[PDB]
Design a protein around this ligand. Structure first.
Ligand SMILES: COc1ccc(CCN(C)CCC[C@](C#N)(c2ccc(OC)c(OC)c2)C(C)C)cc1OC
Ligand SMILES: Nc1ncnc2c1ncn2[C@@H]1O[C@H](COP(=O)(O)OP(=O)(O)OP(=O)(O)O)[C@@H](O)[C@H]1O
Ligand SMILES: Nc1ncnc2c1ncn2[C@@H]1O[C@H](COP(=O)(O)OP(=O)(O)OP(=O)(O)O)[C@@H](O)[C@H]1O
Ligand SMILES: [Mg+2]
Ligand SMILES: [Mg+2]
Length: 1156
């Protein structure tokens, strides 16, 4: 897919013009080097009227700068605008195709995956085609023009530069490869600690229950040691790469200076020519190297566009926009589905429909019979043309469905799904989407027929009542009524209904059925429902069976036949950050960071030191004396450069050595602390979307980088830039004053332009993301419910909505592109203007015999090159704002403290426990939703030698009762006593270790089976004999021994090798290993091999001796086993007492006993 540009051939002229302008701009700079060399030669000759030549050179430079500014502006703006238009066209076409694709194909591919692909690849293509191509062309032009200037300026110097360049290129490539490999290795190494932390967090409930934070922290630290070693190595490698790059650059500078000096002394090209050739060649090589990101983005967008086009270029079997079918004006109710075989493309192995014969008259309430997966919903979908028969025939009114106008059939048909959904728009908006041609009378008619008058009118904006995201403001019955009204709005030739009132209750069932039967003579109504009451009244009823119809006839006939229908009938019967707090790693590298500070100062002086060395070298030729021995002096100066280079390399050898060693350490500290803070966090805090397992893992992982950057690299860059600026400014002021003022007025304008570049880039990215998300809200709303939209056949409406939502920000995108191009051009414009003005005014100054040309050149080079290097260094460090925010969040998390300290030292820990507990007037809903008080003041009391059972409120929050008993949360109200003692005042770890609490679906940590067993209670070693005894007690001795490797075997990811029964048995064995005084099981039975579950329960009852056992199970046996049974209802104990008395009561216990 190399050739990606595919639209607006006329607009392609914009691309051609932009390419030409970029080439002109790129070739401009070598011309700048040539003219600067000529000006330097003129100045040197003056050292050996003058104002006239200086004015001519300044005029040439100013003209070149203005032309380069115009070219840059034109190229940037044109490329950006053309790419934006192309991206808009691509997005529009892509969304059109997606909405026009096949429904079955959409079911084939993930909806979320496709939505993310669109919303991401759009920006990927925009980035890879926006300006990176323009910058690449400009860099190629710079390379070509620099090479041409070098060749036309001299042979020996050009050869030397060409020989120097590829060594630097290869060194840069090797350094980049090493850095990438180191980063990948470090991420892989840290993955172990990341997995450990993720497992701990996900198992947070079990971890807190067992109080095993110590072992997890130890493992995390063990991994973090190697992780920090690798990170320090990688940081040192990156710093050494930068150092070696600078050292090689300086060495090339010194070698070129020596060679040019020798040539000039030998009568070769003048000093100006040699300097121009050298600088032009170096800058061209720099541009060639800097062209890489454009090519990388080109390749990335190439792959993205290949995938996107493949998606778009797909030709769907069912096309919404297609109109090749014949659409008769008069439709008479007549449907035929003969030998209709149909299989889901998602699951092609099984043919859900294996052929059947069925006919449908006109205006007949055809009803379908069959159990789940019998072929009812799929039958309707095939009838609705959502798919086609694998082997069969489908026709309407004596005509094949495919042989008719797809759009007309879709519009003239009505489909009501068992799970109706309304778009996120006002009820009136959704109704209009159902039928725009209603004319405001059909709306009222439907509202009255479906009874959408009271509910519809009640909400604010009776007709225009807005519905929350996904229609969260409407109830199930109201939603079903609205869907029915919307279906009736179209008044289709035929309609189909499923799950009339299968949402919450049959109250709407009566009204819904009455309304549906009110208007059914004029159109055939496919009847689908979960209640035989509605099915009985059907005029015509037919059965389904394994993709075939056997039973048939009305309710009376079906009952007489005593078929499957008769069987069903019988069955019915943003905190602020602290900058100083950031200095918490000083305890590690406070004296160590001094070496890094010294290295940074050394580099920031070396830059201006190189400036001074170059000034001296230039002055050597500028010296009128020009002795032969001056060459030696020149060599001396040249030698200095080489020395400076070494000082650079060693300097880097220190920087990465220090900061790395510092930063990783700090990282480790944070890693040791942040997660530790998470460990000592109340379970209440864990109940929060902000504290999401994935979110917490990402914060822990993608925060060490931010904190380390903000701490180390921010200070490093600040110090380096400050040192460079101070040294340069001081040197320039010492060597002249007026030129110092000129350079100080010139350079900061360029610096401000460079900063504004990044500011505008970030702001534009944010604004583009905002607008794209604005459009994508509606895009996704349509995509997720794609089936409903297709049924409605209103795809054009969503297409128009997306078109408007994209056009509205398209103009803003174009304007931003134009402004950014203008600013980018102005950057180079100011650059060249200042470059020329500095030379002009320095020539004026020296013409007055005030300042020597050598000093002026020194000051100018210092200012310009130092400013450029400072900007590059500032860009080198990652973003401070994002790093600052991440550090603020990490510091807030670490400083966070728990209302109840799980690691608190103090705590009431009497000699033993009374084996009793009491909770009266208990009140605690939850942290997330306090609007639902769960405990309404229940009463519960456990004593010695008694087991408690929970019944009645199977869903009111019984598990919450166990959780609170474990102190997982804090009661909203109600007194609680631990064996007549303050539960809160009790010990922290003592209570956690004492209680053998289990969960519904325990997740076994992916460690050794023996390791999992021993995880029951740390701080007291668990000899393998104890594990064996616990396994024997919990029927796990045979299970553990039979399992390969015996106890040595380790469970996979949450015990993937063993079924849920094995995991439950292992959890029970671990609990028994804990040997708790009091034990609790909460709905761990389920089915889980009913005989096996009963055996496990019997073992537990035999294990309940000398302990208080809490039992929460949905099995009558569990109710019988419990010594004491307490019910729950309305947050209170509806029933309680003995099992015989509870059964005697006519209460929820009686209903459960009878029904169960
Ligand atoms: C797209 O990025 C670029 C932007 C502008 C330029 C041209 C810069 N010229 C006006 C010369 C200024 C000085 C210069 C820079 N930058 C520089 C001086 C000293 C340096 O330290 C040794 C240096 O290395 C970072 C670069 C160039 C010699 C490469 C090159 C670019 O490619 C690197
Ligand atoms: N991609 C798929 N592959 C296989 N089976 C699927 C697929 N999508 C849905 N199914 C299921 O296959 C069955 C097809 O039968 P159909 O839905 O027509 O009858 P049903 O008994 O009314 O269905 P359901 O049990 O869904 O209410 C349904 O149970 C449906 O949920
Ligand atoms: N942080 C929370 N905020 C709000 N509701 C929560 C929170 N955590 C859990 N819940 C809800 O509390 C209930 C948990 O206890 P639940 O009612 O399921 O216990 P139960 O009586 O054993 O019922 P069942 O066995 O039917 O699930 C669930 O409704 C769960 O959605
Ligand atoms: Mg169904
Ligand atoms: Mg439960």
């Amino acid at each position: 897919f190399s050739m990606f540009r595919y639209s607006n051939w006329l607009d392609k002229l914009y691309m051609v013009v932009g390419t030409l302008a970029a080439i002109i701009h790129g070739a401009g700079l070598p011309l700048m080097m040539l003219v600067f060399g000529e000006m330097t030669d003129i100045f040197a000759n003056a050292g050996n009227n003058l104002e006239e030549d200086m004015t001519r050179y300044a005029y040439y430079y100013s003209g070149i700068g203005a032309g380069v500014l115009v070219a840059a502006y034109i190229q940037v703006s044109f490329w950006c605008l053309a790419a934006g238009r192309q991206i808009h066209k691509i997005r529009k076409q892509f969304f059109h195709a997606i909405m026009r694709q096949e429904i079955g194909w959409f079911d084939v591919h993930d909806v979320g995956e496709l939505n993310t692909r669109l919303t991401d690849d759009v920006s990927k293509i925009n980035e890879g085609i926006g300006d990176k191509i323009g910058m690449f062309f400009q860099s190629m032009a710079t390379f070509f023009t620099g090479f041409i200037v070098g060749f036309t300026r001299g042979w020996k110097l050009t050869l030397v530069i060409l020989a120097i360049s590829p060594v630097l290129g290869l060194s840069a490539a090797v350094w980049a490869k090493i850095l990438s490999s180191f980063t990948d290795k470090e991420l892989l190494a840290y993955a172990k600690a990341g997995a450990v932390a993720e497992e701990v967090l996900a198992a947070i409930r079990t971890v807190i229950a067992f109080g095993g934070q110590k072992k997890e922290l130890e493992r995390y630290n063990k991994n973090l040691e190697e992780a920090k070693r690798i990170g320090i190595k990688k940081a040192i490698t990156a710093n050494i790469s930068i150092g070696a790059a600078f050292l090689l650059i300086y060495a090339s500078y010194a070698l070129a200076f020596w060679y040019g000096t020798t040539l000039v002394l030998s009568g070769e090209y003048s000093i100006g020519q040699v300097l121009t050739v050298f600088f032009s060649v170096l800058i061209g090589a720099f541009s060639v190297g800097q062209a890489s990101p454009s090519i990388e983005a080109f390749a990335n967008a190439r792959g993205a566009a290949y995938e996107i086009f493949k998606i778009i270029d797909n030709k769907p079997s069912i096309d919404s926009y297609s109109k090749s079918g014949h659409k008769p004006d008069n439709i008479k109710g007549n449907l035929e589905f003969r030998n209709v075989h149909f299989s889901y493309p998602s699951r092609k192995e099984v043919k859900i429909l294996k052929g059947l014969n069925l006919k449908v008259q006109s205006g007949q309430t055809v009803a379908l019979v069959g159990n789940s997966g019998c072929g009812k919903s799929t039958t309707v979908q095939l009838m609705q043309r959502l798919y086609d028969p694998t082997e069969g025939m489908v026709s309407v009114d004596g005509q094949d469905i495919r042989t008719i106008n797809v759009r007309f059939l879709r519009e003239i048909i009505g489909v009501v799904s068992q799970e109706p959904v309304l778009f996120a728009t006002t009820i009136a908006e959704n109704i209009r989407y159902g039928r725009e041609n209603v004319t405001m009378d059909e709306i009222e008619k439907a509202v009255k027929e479906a009874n959408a008058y009271d509910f519809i009118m009640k909400l604010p904006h009776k007709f225009d009542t807005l519905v929350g995201e996904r229609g969260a403001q409407l109830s199930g019955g109201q939603k079903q009524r609205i869907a029915i009204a919307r279906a009736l709005v179209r008044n289709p030739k035929i309609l189909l209904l499923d799950e009339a009132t299968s949402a919450l209750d049959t109250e709407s069932e009566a009204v819904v059925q009455v309304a549906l039967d009110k208007a059914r003579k004029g159109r055939t109504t496919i009847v689908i429902a979960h209640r035989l009451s509605t099915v009985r009244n059907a005029d015509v009823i037919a059965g389904f069976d394994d993709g075939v119809i056997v039973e048939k006839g009305n309710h009376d006939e079906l009952m007489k036949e005593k078929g499957i229908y008769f069987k069903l009938v019988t069955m019915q019967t943003i905190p602020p950050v602290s900058f100083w707090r950031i200095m918490k790693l000083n305890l590690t590298e406070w004296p160590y960071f001094v070496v890094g500070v010294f290295c940074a100062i050394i580099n920031g002086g070396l830059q201006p030191a190189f400036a001074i060395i170059f000034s001296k070298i230039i002055g050597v030729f500028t010296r009128i004396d020009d002795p032969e021995t001056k060459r030696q002096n020149s060599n001396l100066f040249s030698l200095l450069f080489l020395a400076l280079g070494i000082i650079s390399f060693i300097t880097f050898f220190l920087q990465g050595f220090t900061f790395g060693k510092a930063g990783e350490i700090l990282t480790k500290r944070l890693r040791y602390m942040v997660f530790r803070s998470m460990l000592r966090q109340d379970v209440s805090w864990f109940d929060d979307p902000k504290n999401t397992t994935g979110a917490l893992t990402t914060r822990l992982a993608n925060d060490a980088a931010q904190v380390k950057g903000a701490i180390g690299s921010r200070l490093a860059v600040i110090t380096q830039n400050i040192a460079n600026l101070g040294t340069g400014i001081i040197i320039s002021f010492i060597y002249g004053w007026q030129l110092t003022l000129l350079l100080l007025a010139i350079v900061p304008i360029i610096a401000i332009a460079g900063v504004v570049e990044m500011k505008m880039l970030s702001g534009q990215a944010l604004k583009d993301k905002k607008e794209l998300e604005g459009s994508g809200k509606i895009a996704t709303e349509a995509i997720e419910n794609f089936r409903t939209v297709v049924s409605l056949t209103q795809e054009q409406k969503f297409e128009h909505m997306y078109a408007q939502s994209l056009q509205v920000p398209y103009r803003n995108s174009l304007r931003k592109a134009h402004i950014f191009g203008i600013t980018f051009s102005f950057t180079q414009a100011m650059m060249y203007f200042s470059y020329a003005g500095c030379f002009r005014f320095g020539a004026y100054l020296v013409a007055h015999k005030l300042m020597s040309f050598e000093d002026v050149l020194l000051v100018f080079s210092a200012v310009v090159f130092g400013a450029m290097a400072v900007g590059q260094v500032s860009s080198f460090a990652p973003d401070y704002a994002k790093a600052k925010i991440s550090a603020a969040h990490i510091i807030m998390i670490i400083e966070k403290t728990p209302l109840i300290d799980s690691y608190s030292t103090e705590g009431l820990m009497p000699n033993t426990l009374e084996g009793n507990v009491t909770f009266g007037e208990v009140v605690f809903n939850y942290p997330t939703r306090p609007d639902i008080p769960v405990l309404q003041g229940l009463s519960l009391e456990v004593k010695k030698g008694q087991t408690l059972a929970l019944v009645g409120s199977s869903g009111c929050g019984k598990s919450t009762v166990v959780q609170l008993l474990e102190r997982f949360y804090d009661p909203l109200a109600g007194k609680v006593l631990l064996d007549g003692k303050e539960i809160k005042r009790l010990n922290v770890q003592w209570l956690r270790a004492h209680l053998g609490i289990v969960s519904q679906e325990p997740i076994l940590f992916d460690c050794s089976i023996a390791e999992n067993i021993a995880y029951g209670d740390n701080s007291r070693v668990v000899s393998q004999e104890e594990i064996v005894r616990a396994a024997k007690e919990a029927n796990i001795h045979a299970f553990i021994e039979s399992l390969p490797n015996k106890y040595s075997t380790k469970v996979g990811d949450k015990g993937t090798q063993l079924s849920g029964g094995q995991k439950q048995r292992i959890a029970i064995a671990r609990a028994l290993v804990r040997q708790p005084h009091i034990l609790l099981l909460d709905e761990a039975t389920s089915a889980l091999d009913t005989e096996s579950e009963k055996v496990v329960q019997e073992a537990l009852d035999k294990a309940r001796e000398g302990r208080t056992c809490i039992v929460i199970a949905h099995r009558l046996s569990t109710i019988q086993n419990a010594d004491l049974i307490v019910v729950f209802q309305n947050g209170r104990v509806k029933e309680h007492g003995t099992h015989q008395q509870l059964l005697a009561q006519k209460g929820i216990y009686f209903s459960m006993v009878s029904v169960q």
